[PDB]
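Submission sheet (multi-component)
Chains listed below:
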Amino acid sequence: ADPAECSIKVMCRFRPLNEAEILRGDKFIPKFKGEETVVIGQGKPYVFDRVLPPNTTQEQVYNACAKQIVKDVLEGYNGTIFAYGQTSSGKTHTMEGKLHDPQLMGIIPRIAHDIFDHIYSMDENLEFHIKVSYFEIYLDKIRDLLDVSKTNLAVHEDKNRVPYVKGCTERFVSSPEEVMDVIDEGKANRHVAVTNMNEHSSRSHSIFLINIKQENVETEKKLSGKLYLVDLAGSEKV
Amino acid sequence: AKNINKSLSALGNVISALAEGTKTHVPYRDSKMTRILQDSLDGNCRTTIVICCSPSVFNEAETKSTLMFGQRAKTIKNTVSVNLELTAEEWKKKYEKEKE
Ligand SMILES: Nc1ncnc2c1ncn2[C@@H]1O[C@H](COP(=O)(O)OP(=O)(O)O)[C@@H](O)[C@H]1O
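Outcome: structure written.
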């Protein structure tokens, strides 16, 4: 069958001014036009797949940026969502938010719930196997957040010649709560041997990987899709 | 000057090269992070980037660098297919059917 072409989607989220910006009286610079454009002063317009103003709720972010990825992964595509932007621009708010709060939780916890809501309604002939892994990269070294004794995991290539982290803990999960248990576990473990979490989290990448495998027991076909959910280190210059 | 994170200059170099159309010596190997993202940026993957920005005038130069990263990234295309696996017996049946 022939493959399809698809562009990398780009959504831009402007968070509200922060406590220091408001107390310093900072002006709000962006100007919005329609659902996709933003202009900074007299500069040329920037057009994205979506521009999300400060008044966007976490659930509106999720619908605009991640809801489709979950459907795509459940059809057997590989899918990746990464957040990018300078330290304090809102990356962790976006990918995690307040993890267990229904209104403030971010993208990762909402995907943890939505993957199960879709699976419960799928075809009765399918058998599912979902394994998650949680790791970080700091000074070009990979530490397993589910086993912090492993602080230099290597990258190898899988059977489709695709790079993957070798030797990383993998946990099979069968509910949104089991996914959130892994995240809670890795969040706590990450403080181990870190002497400043504010600085560390700003200079490190956090990667949550959800590997979704499906088998049609009648047709004998299998689909699989790896969904990478990445919270990059800050992109600011020295 | 340079990005605080060398994996972030590596990532800006990878997006720039891909946005240019160069894809020869695109520097994925400059960092583990860009190695892990190689398939999301030039492989068999449907990728979405959420660029996060402060709306303060104080952050304007960093904001513009983030918007430029997004504008370049959005032009990148990938060729994608679902990851389907067939047993050898079903695969041979489709082949024979496709061959007749
Ligand atoms: N969309 C938002 N709504 C409310 N507060 C936000 C939002 N985005 C960011 N913040 C605030 O900014 C602070 C830093 O945001 P964060 O997500 O941690 O930035 P980054 O991960 O990019 O360093 C968060 O503690 C919070 O106070």
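Remark: Chain A has one domain: 1-238.
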